[PDB]
Amino acid sequence: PRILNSDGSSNITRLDDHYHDLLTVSWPVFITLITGLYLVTNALFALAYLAVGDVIENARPGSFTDAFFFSVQTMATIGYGKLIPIGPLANTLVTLEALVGMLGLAVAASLIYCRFCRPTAGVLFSSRMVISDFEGKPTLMMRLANLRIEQIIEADVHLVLVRSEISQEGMVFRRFHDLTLTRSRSPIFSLSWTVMHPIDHHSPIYGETDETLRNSHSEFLVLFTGHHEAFAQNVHARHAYSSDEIIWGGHFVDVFTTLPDGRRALDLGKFHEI
Amino acid sequence: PRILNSDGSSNITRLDDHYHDLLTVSWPVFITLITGLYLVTNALFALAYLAVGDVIENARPGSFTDAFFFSVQTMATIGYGKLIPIGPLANTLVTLEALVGMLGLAVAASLIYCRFCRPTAGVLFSSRMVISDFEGKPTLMMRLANLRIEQIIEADVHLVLVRSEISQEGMVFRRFHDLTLTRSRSPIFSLSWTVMHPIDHHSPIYGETDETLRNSHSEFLVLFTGHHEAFAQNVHARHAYSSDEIIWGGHFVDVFTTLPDGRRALDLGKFHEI
Amino acid sequence: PRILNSDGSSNITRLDDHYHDLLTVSWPVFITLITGLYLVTNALFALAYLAVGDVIENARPGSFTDAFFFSVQTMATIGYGKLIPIGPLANTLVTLEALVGMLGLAVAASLIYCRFCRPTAGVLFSSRMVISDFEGKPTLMMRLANLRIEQIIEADVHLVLVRSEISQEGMVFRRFHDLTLTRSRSPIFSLSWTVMHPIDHHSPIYGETDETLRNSHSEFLVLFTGHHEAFAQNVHARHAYSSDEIIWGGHFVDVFTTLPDGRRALDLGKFHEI
Amino acid sequence: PRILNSDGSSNITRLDDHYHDLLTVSWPVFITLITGLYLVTNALFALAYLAVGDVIENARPGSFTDAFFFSVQTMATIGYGKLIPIGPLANTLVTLEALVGMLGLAVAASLIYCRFCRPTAGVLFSSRMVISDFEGKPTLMMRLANLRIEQIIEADVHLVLVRSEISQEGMVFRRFHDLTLTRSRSPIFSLSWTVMHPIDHHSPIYGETDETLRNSHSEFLVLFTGHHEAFAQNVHARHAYSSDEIIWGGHFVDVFTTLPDGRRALDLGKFHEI
Ligand SMILES: *Cc1c(C)c(=O)n2c(=O)c(C)c(C)n12
Ligand SMILES: *Cc1c(C)c(=O)n2c(=O)c(C)c(C)n12
Ligand SMILES: *Cc1c(C)c(=O)n2c(=O)c(C)c(C)n12
Ligand SMILES: *Cc1c(C)c(=O)n2c(=O)c(C)c(C)n12
Ligand SMILES: [K+]
Ligand SMILES: [K+]
């Protein structure tokens, strides 16, 4: 019955988005798609030439081979000069094809640039959360790791409790309780950041149990935002956990430890370790 | 007499913006415009060649057909080699035309990319607003829906009352009262967000009536901002309502409901439902 | 002796930035510069060919005309086929020239796009400021006008007093007192926004006079920021005033007024009117 | 044992990122790399043609010279018309090569644009920090200088103490104490900004000494952010200092001074001067 899946995406069911598709497909699929149109549009132009007749020098009438490779030479602006258009109709088709060719190039280039500036937030989230005595006070925790060689500026993470509540009006709704963190922004997120919500008497989760979290349909959202180093621009990552993914009394293993010389170093093997 | 129309744009009358125009026209209009210049500039170059005389091989003197398709072959960098320039003047025109051709390409490409990164904030606003007992306390509400498959990060919406007020100096002005919301930022805007302003004793709208809202020229602005999922960058949407578009005692129908299996799903048919 | 000029730029004297230059020059200058290199690089390549000898078909040995137009045909990828390279040296120069040609295109295109996305904050600031009785309380004011057809989202303006002060340590410095405004953010900046700082007992400028403002070297900075409508991205504008540019008891004329039908309309003639 | 090096990067040891590499290499290296692939891909295509046999007009069978320069003429879309493909296989290779050529162009262009919009935060940080009596109160200071002709909008700097602390649970961790500054945001960063943290009774560093700072492993981070003038977009700079890089009782020399006429001017020689 869980609200938001672990990836942050929700279990809410939806009752031709080409934009989204073109940007999300893997690079091999994209190249295939680009090529697919490229071959198809050249084929449509080849058919347009032969529908005018044998309007191509070096071409045999009815030969798609000659028409297609002439279309390519035209669209691609090669213009070898062996296969050349004949008549006003063919020359008009060439004028339209050349416009298409260099215009499409512009379209492809904007796609490629946009696929290059994909905010690949190389952040790793802990498999589960813990609620343990910190300073002797019970505290809710999970952690993040920067997998990229790079660093993140003004990294602001929020621990958001999304739980179902009822009003005196009778309306049932889910409200987003932003939790008070020990650190809400790590101006430099470069290592592994353990995010903590101390459970004080003001805390929205004060006094809750495994049982009451389930009964309140308690769902914990982790929203991560930050400005990448090599990139410049923002990167965003999300993860969500249910009450079932919380470890009572749980303690994480510090990923940072000291080398023989005395220098501190990070072991990401120890990331999912409690 | 309403201040801001429902789209957010105002009824304030204005007493050659090509930039704006080129970006706002529909894609068919844009393609036509791009083509329009393309044909016109090739025509101007064709005229420039014939003004030099018969400076083109394969061309008849006075033939615009030959000059135009030679211009296209030049601007588009095809260079078949059938129609070729004759003399220093023609060759200088070719050098300028080639610069124009590849330079314009750059201009078109920047237009196309900019038309692709149009923040299409796929947000749907409720037709009207309501003021109903929430928790038994009267509360002002309206709602938003994400029509895009995607999600929105750090979505901050503001309910802004723009009403006319008078000072002891005698100046009449409209001030923007930002209203205290139950949720002012939905870190993840993925479903339908019902925005609420509880009308408490501190609220700027405490104790107002349909009558007094009209007399105070009360106008409600809804400003929506958020960072798109597939996009990365910000999207923005706005809507405005007058006192006449407010429903006293009105109650929205929850768009979220439970499937046979038990999973929650959203019915956007029920969006404009009170 | 004034700190910051009216444009926001300072009177502080500086005791080959091509980037900045290429973006700031007017469009005619930019086109001339682009053309300038284009002609120069083609000339350098033409010289490179003739330094190899008569390595061009249709060319006379020693003819720069033939070499230059062959260079253009190569760099621009025309490849008519009349003037063609001879030998491994010429063909190597062609391979380098073709790389240069299409690579430079990429360079030019990035310049053009960047010159297109110049945040042209079409904001107009009032010539002077005023300090007048508002609600009977003395208040410091100036105003802004959106000259663009478009609107601005989350427009946050700050009235910053930059005045010289001295410490018990003896250090003299200028500090940036951010002033409490009646409206610090106009979520929708579409018309003319009059920015006001009420001079209360907590205000940093409480009780100052024309005389004491001059003696404290009081300088008022206006920083404007907002997210453009047709653009999407941020626009920024700045203006600064000295104590000498402040009008004591001054009152602006409202730019908004009512048409015969009853609709409100804006008269920007009345902008610089006190 | 110092946590973060003076550049902001940390001494934490890491226990094929082409993206990062392509953007970070110097311009000469990038041009060499672009050229490197360009030559290699043309060589692979040349080999592909000769593997089909003597499928090129003007070419000698087995001549890589002819095949390579034909490949260049094809990939670059020159199409002189001297060397032309023979057969369906060669013509198919040409169709793929032309796609590769103009597609790669798009790839290169996105790289070049991205290398152009490198946020070169031309900010200079003071070599060391000082802790001196300001207003008679001990205060922690360092300073920034804008080396670029340009200015920076909404410049927000944070003085972050990263020190090791221990909990009642026994966990040892480093926490990021954001220090209260005299100025935390210089809406216009144009000159030299001296950042100060007054050491009051609430300050996290109140009462610390050179000795106790070392023993608490006190590390001072300086995070700088701002929106560039000619750029538009954000720029970011960072620097970090250890307790060993702090000067007790230290006083900076003002970089701003008055010319003969009376105008204020900045001497950056005096930047690293205490
Ligand atoms: C265009 C581009 C390249 C080459 C790259 O590596 N990435 C980034 O990291 C950003 C910020 C962008 C844009 N892209
Ligand atoms: C360039 C581009 C493409 C291909 C697209 O779908 N959209 C977006 O969603 C963004 C953010 C941009 C830019 N564009
Ligand atoms: C690329 C471009 C165009 C065509 C334009 O009008 N402007 C804008 O308004 C923005 C935001 C950008 C970028 N440019
Ligand atoms: C594209 C570009 C150019 C030409 C330049 O100088 N810089 C900047 O300053 C920005 C903001 C960008 C992008 N680039
Ligand atoms: K060509
Ligand atoms: K040719």
Residue numbers in the entry:
A (entry chain A), B (entry chain A), C (entry chain A), D (entry chain A): 12 to 26, 35 to 293
Which text from the study accompanies this structure?
Potassium channels propagate electrical signals, maintain membrane potentials and facilitate numerous downstream cellular processes. KirBac3.1 adopts the canonical fold of a K+ channel, with inner and outer membrane-spanning helices supporting an inclined, shorter, pore helix that supports the signature selectivity filter. All feature an hourglass-like constriction at the intracellular opening, leading to the widespread conclusion that the canonical permeation gate at the helix bundle crossing is closed (or nearly so) in all Kir structures, whether determined by crystallography or single-particle cryo-EM. Thus, data presented here indicate that inward rectifiers (Kir) are able to conduct without requiring the substantial conformational changes predicted by the canonical gating mechanism.
To covalently constrain the dimensions of the hourglass-like constriction, paired cysteine point mutants were introduced into KirBac3.1 upon a cysteine-less background, in which each of the three native cysteine residues were substituted for serine or valine (C262S, C71V, C119V). This allowed us to covalently link the four inner helices into a tetramer without obstructing the conduction pathway. Following purification of A133C-T136C and S129C-F135C, covalent linkages between adjacent subunits were generated, either by direct disulfide formation using Cu2+ as the oxidant or by the crosslinking reagents 1,1-methanediyl bismethanethiosulfonate (MTS-1-MTS), which forms compact linkages (CysS–S–CH2–S–SCys) with slightly more tolerance than direct disulfides (CysS–SCys), and dibromobimane, a rigid bicyclic molecule. To visually inspect the channels for intact crosslinks or unanticipated effects on structure, crystal structures of two of the KirBac3.1 adducts, S129C-F135C-MTS-1-MTS and A133C-T136C-bimane were determined. In both mutants, four crosslinks encircle the conduction pathway at the Tyr132 as anticipated. Both revealed electron density bridging between adjacent inner helices, consistent with the predicted covalent linkages. An overlay of both crosslinked structures onto the native pore is illustrated. The cysteine-pair mutants were assayed under identical experimental conditions to wild type. All eight variants of the S129C-F135C or A133C-T136C mutants, either with reduced cysteine sulfhydryl moieties or as covalently-linked adducts with inner helices tethered at Tyr132, mediated K+ movement out of liposomes, with no significant difference in signal from wild type in any of the crosslinked populations, indicating that crosslinking did not prevent K+ flux through the Kir channels. The differences in rate (and overall signal) between crosslinked and reduced forms of the pore are not significant, which indicates the enforced constriction is not rate limiting.
